[model samples]
Target: TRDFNGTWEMESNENFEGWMKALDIDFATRKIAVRLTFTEVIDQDGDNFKTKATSTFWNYDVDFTVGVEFDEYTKSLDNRHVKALVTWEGDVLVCVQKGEKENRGWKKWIEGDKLYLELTCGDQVCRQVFKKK
Candidate 1:
């Protein structure tokens, strides 16, 4: 069986701003909140499954296999202190982010070609969808 792969045309975001601010996301000047516009690119045919988050201002990425323990990083956060892992439990590709007062992460799963992104921060879970072609 295969996991998530391809570029998803992100659409229909809910509770985006809430999750963004929950993790101290300041948008970094012109730093627009989520849902305005972005693309979720997943290169996971089987190896080095990483995410390329595209934005109007910049792009973001976090490199971590499901087992290799390493420090997670991204440009937007400006906070490079993160420990995380990504694995699939059933159909859900879940991520466990360990941080100091920031136990936040997101999940990506497919519902028959429809891309669904679920993010959890603090106590709220938000949803995002994308089209695959």
Candidate 2:
């Protein structure tokens, strides 16, 4: 299994607000979310893995296994339902979420010591960089 077990802190976010709006996230929530810094802690134990994403106002947890598909209720982010599928594609963790939003999900990779996360929704692609703690 790929070892993505680390505490990652946000460095920068690009087109984040645009993506949030595309998801129909409220203006007030987007206002708060846009300014707060986020931290992601990935805890992987065999195929049962847990990733916690947090900021000043939000705390979201996603649990999944490699090659395993499950229904992930993403209430913290966008509050949409999706069929979550996680897989490792060339050292990058790729998640394909299928539901209300078509072709939406995220792909994360470690470039050197930095974490690169790309969020996709429709025509918007928000890129976020992270550093290890």
Candidate 3:
């Protein structure tokens, strides 16, 4: 089991471009993101937490409580509006987004000394790895 309550830096991305394309992001956006670094800051307080993903090109923030619903916006990606809820399945953090696309959202899991993130939008999926500092 793990608690994601610290700063994490992106290590690698798998199928990142595909996920961006699925979101219909501009080519310029995709190009900018590919070479940029991303960092995640997670603050956990019991069952409620705040997460922020920061990059040179853009930033994303999420505030959520387990089993509670909240509004989500993918500002840099598709700029879509969705209601999302996060839950814990063992040590993994699972998020389900209810909105325009089917099977959209993400999951966060930790393995060994590394953090793993899987993001899904419509039919495209991206997997990323991060290391805790």
Candidate 4:
């Protein structure tokens, strides 16, 4: 089991704009999104989890149970409907989104007191590091 139930602040981000582009985001959104930092609040209760990404521009929230697929509406991010599944790959939490996009998924894991997020869309991979708050 990993500790992902706390609030985390973004320490650094890498190639997030590239990943946004892969998701077909507009240039204006990408420009502003890349300039913003995010704070993630995760509430994990047994197999159910709620994750919220707060930013100056917009916020995105997702809640799901592990191993159970749910219909996810990505409103502020891409405004796409997806069949989202979150699973535990050892200690790491992995999410796979099935939609119009290809190779869409994200991985979350903890290293020491820091949280690591890897967002994948097509060939672009956006890596982000967060400190536990």
Whose lDDT is greatest here?
4
TM-score of each: 0.84, 0.93, 0.92, 0.96
Clash pairs detected, candidate 1: 27-31
lDDT of 1 by residue, 1-133 (tens): 3467788887678887777667767765324655367787887755467778887776887666765666666456647577777777777777877876455888877888788888888877778999885
For residues 27-49, write the lDDT of model 3, one tens digit per residue: 99898887888999999888889
- Residue 79 of model 4 has an lDDT of 88
lDDT of each: 0.73, 0.88, 0.88, 0.93
Model 4 RMSD in angstroms: 0.9
Ranking by lDDT: 4, 3, 2, 1
Superior candidate under TM-score, 2 versus 3:
2
Cα lDDT tens digits for candidate 2, 11-52: 999999989988898999998899989999999887678999
Clashing pairs in 4: none
Cα miss at 7, model 4 (Å)?
0.8
Question: Cα miss at 67, model 2 (Å)?
Answer: 0.7
What is the full ranking by TM-score, best candidate first? 4, 2, 3, 1
Backbone clashes in candidate 2 total 0
Name the candidate, 2 or 4, with the larger lDDT value: 4
What overall lDDT, based on C-alpha atoms, would model 3 receive against the true structure?
A: 0.88
Give the C-alpha miss distance for residue 113 in model 3, angstroms.
1.4
Span of ten consecutive residues with least summed lDDT in model 2: 72-81
| Model 3 TM | 0.92
